[PDB]
Swiss-Prot record:
Proteins of this family have an N-terminal nuclease domain and a C-terminal helicase/ATPase domain. In some CRISPR/Cas systems the domains are swapped, in others they are encoded separately. This is CRISPR-associated endonuclease/helicase Cas3. The chain holds residues 6 to 260 of 920 of the full protein. Residues 11-177 form the HD Cas3-type domain. One of its GO terms (biological process) is defense response to virus. A divalent metal cation binds at residues 21, 66-67, 175. CRISPR (clustered regularly interspaced short palindromic repeat), is an adaptive immune system that provides protection against mobile genetic elements (viruses, transposable elements and conjugative plasmids). CRISPR clusters contain sequences complementary to antecedent mobile elements and target invading nucleic acids. CRISPR clusters are transcribed and processed into CRISPR RNA (crRNA). Cas3 plus Cascade participate in CRISPR interference, the third stage of CRISPR immunity. The N-terminal domain (residues 6-260) acts as a ssDNA endonuclease, has no activity on dsDNA.
Amino acid sequence: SMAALALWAKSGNPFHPLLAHMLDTAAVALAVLRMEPPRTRALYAEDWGLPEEGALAWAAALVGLHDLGKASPVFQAWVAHGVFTELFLRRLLKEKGLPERAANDLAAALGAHHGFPANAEEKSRARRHLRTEDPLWKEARRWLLEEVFRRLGAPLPPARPEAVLRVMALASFADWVASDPSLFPYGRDPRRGDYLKEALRLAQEALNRLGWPAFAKAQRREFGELFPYI
């Protein structure tokens, strides 16, 4: 069963499914895009040729896939998991209908080196692992991507470098926030219909806390969007 394999994959702790971490990451992305200035949100709408509401859902779902590279036996019970995320997304984003060049760039945006593509030696090592894994893993990773896109209600766009870099920086920040169990406690069940509403509430609380005077001390401006400088 590919669904069981997909749900069994863990992130960061045996009691925290990878899917829970991916949905938490998407929830932080969506919450912080809603708080960005109107100029920033209009940039996303223009980047992707979507009404603003669809553009933010698209971007949030993409960012949720940052740790999709963990959906491999290599990371469950050396090359960084982000190299796997990049290889998986090059294929998976094209199957969803994105044109080759946009898929390849977004795959690197969500990879191991903050938007710069994995090198030949990293990819050779990863592909060595991929050749000997159980084939069900390839199916499980497609299942996980479909679950996030479906949960977020993400539409496909009908990609300029700044658009890709905007997703890169957003994914770096959202994955960081969602990775802190003090903000996003382990043990929530992502099979539940109420999971995303609860993850959005936790995201709003976390963004509020990270902004408090003893944490945030200035702002980081990157590619026309803003984050707290911690």
